[PDB]
Amino acid sequence: ANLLTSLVRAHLDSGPSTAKLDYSKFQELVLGKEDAGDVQQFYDLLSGSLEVIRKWAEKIPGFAELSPADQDLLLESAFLELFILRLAYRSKPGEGKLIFCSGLVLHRLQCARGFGDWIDSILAFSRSLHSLLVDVPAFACLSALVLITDRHGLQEPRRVEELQNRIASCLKEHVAASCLSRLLGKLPELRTLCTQGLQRIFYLKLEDLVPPPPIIDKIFMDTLPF
Amino acid sequence: ANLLTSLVRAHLDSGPSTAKLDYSKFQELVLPHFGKEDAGDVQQFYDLLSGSLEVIRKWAEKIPGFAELSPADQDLLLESAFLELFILRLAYRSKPGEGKLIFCSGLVLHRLQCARGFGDWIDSILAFSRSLHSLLVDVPAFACLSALVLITDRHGLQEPRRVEELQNRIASCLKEHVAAVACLSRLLGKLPELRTLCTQGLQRIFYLKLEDLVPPPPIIDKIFMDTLPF
Numbered sequence: 001a002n003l004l005t006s007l008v009r010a011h012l013d014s015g016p017s018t019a020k021l022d023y024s025k026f027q028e029l030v031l032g033k034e035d036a037g038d039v040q041q042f043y044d045l046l047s048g049s050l051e052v053i054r055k056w057a058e059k060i061p062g063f064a065e066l067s068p069a070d071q072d073l074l075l076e077s078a079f080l081e082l083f084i085l086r087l088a089y090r091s092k093p094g095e096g097k098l099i100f101c102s103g104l105v106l107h108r109l110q111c112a113r114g115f116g117d118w119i120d121s122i123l124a125f126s127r128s129l130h131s132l133l134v135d136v137p138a139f140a141c142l143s144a145l146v147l148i149t150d151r152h153g154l155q156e157p158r159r160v161e162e163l164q165n166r167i168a169s170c171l172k173e174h175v176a177a178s179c180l181s182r183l184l185g186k187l188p189e190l191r192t193l194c195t196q197g198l199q200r201i202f203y204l205k206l207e208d209l210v211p212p213p214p215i216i217d218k219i220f221m222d223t224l225p226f
Numbered sequence: 227a228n229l230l231t232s233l234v235r236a237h238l239d240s241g242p243s244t245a246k247l248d249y250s251k252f253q254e255l256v257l258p259h260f261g262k263e264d265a266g267d268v269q270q271f272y273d274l275l276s277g278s279l280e281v282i283r284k285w286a287e288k289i290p291g292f293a294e295l296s297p298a299d300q301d302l303l304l305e306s307a308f309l310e311l312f313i314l315r316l317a318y319r320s321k322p323g324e325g326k327l328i329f330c331s332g333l334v335l336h337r338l339q340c341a342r343g344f345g346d347w348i349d350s351i352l353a354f355s356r357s358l359h360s361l362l363v364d365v366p367a368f369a370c371l372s373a374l375v376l377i378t379d380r381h382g383l384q385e386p387r388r389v390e391e392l393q394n395r396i397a398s399c400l401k402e403h404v405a406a407v408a409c410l411s412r413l414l415g416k417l418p419e420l421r422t423l424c425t426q427g428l429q430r431i432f433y434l435k436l437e438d439l440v441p442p443p444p445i446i447d448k449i450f451m452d453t454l455p456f
């Protein structure tokens with residue numbers, strides 16, 4: 001309740017006001033393979049969500065009560081899933097319009113060189129997500145359920161499960177006020193999309209036009225199970 | 227050249243004769259669920275990779291001079307070229323007009339049976355097989371070209387001058403033969419398509435390691451890790 005209110009406040013504070021939106025670089029008709037500028041932009045757009053998602057998670061009630069190690073581990077493990085889910089929800093797949101958490105608005109063709117195919121899969125997911133007409137409260141719970149989840153190497157797993165359970169109840173409680181099971185149905189498809197992001201970074205690291213910035217690199221390495 | 231004879235012997239010994247082709251697992255049509263794979267598809271993918279390295283190892287030991295390079299230079303050349311060699315040899319021996327992959331053991335598998343294990347990569351390899359086939363490279367030239375892919379400059383060679391020496395020798399053996407029967411610049415034009423296909427193979431292994439239905443065999447894994455510049 002106060003939980004839901006807290007989760008909603010943290011969500012809306014973590015993104016641009018419809019008025020803080022910037023179309024000054026938006027182009028509805030532009031025209032090759034990726035160059036260094038496309039790869040820089042890809043890393044820059046990813047990097048732009050790092051501090052924002054960190055500050056969002058600190059405002060999730062209970063999140064600061066977890067061990068610093070479990071905090072860092074949860075953030076690293078969900079970063080990509082969180083970037084995708086939040087971009088999918090904020091974006092306008094009907095116009096092929098990507099809206100980033102800084103307020104930057106770009107057409108798919110303007111990011112497509114950097115992201116590759118993954119951008120199309122993300123837009124497919126955005127359309128699927130948009131179709132379920134998820135309200136902000138539900139999404140504020142969903143996004144937190146993506147963060148506060150079991151990962152390998154948690155010190156206090158029981159406490160993470162506890163807090164997940166609490167957020168899950170706050171969500172069910174709100175939805176009652178199969179629809180739940182279709183919301184929760186989008187967490188595994190989000191993990192599959194996470195995989196494509198790891199594939200793309202792998203590929204970009206191979207190609208090495210521009211190296212990933214240290215923090216993305218660490219997320220990449222620390223999130224490989226092998 | 228006695229070298230060319232040696233190079234041809236090693237090439238022809240390193241694959242099936244048109245008689246020892248094995249259709250015991252071939253199915254002209256299977257109905258796969260695409261974009262996914264089971265443990266059986268992934269084990270076979272690794273087994274086909276594994277089997278090609280063992281055959282390519284034995285082929286390279288038959289290249290005159292190759293056995294007298296340092297053990298370290300031998301391993302480094304084999305690792306560095308393995309994927310290019312697997313692709314080039316598979317492209318050359320395969321029948322893309324019948325959608326037929328032919329492996330160095332003699333095993334024949336339809337495009338659709340390889341789709342689950344290999345993904346897209348198998349289709350790009352068939353595109354390359356067609357491109358390669360259309361250049362009408364004879365066995366002697368290909369026996370030299372495959373060796374030139376192996377015996378080449380790489381970072382971390384202990385005796386690079388000796389590798390260049392042996393490269394030079396195999397290069398002359400090739401020129402001498404192309405003049406004898408009488409496309410080279412045209413062959414070199416398809417070297418980026420091959421480099422891309424090497425990238426696609428690293429992408430596929432990456433993905434399969436992520437997925438981890440079955441672990442990669444140690445030797446393929448070491449080639450994967452040692453072959454990533456980072």
Ligand SMILES: CCCCCCCCCCCCOC(=O)c1ccc2[nH]cnc2c1
Binds near residue numbers: 372374379417
């Ligand atoms: C159909 C495209 C290529 C088929 C084989 C012809 C090329 C022979 C080997 C490459 C050129 C001579 O050797 C090299 O300098 C060399 C060797 C291995 C390489 N791997 C990637 N680039 C390479 C270049």
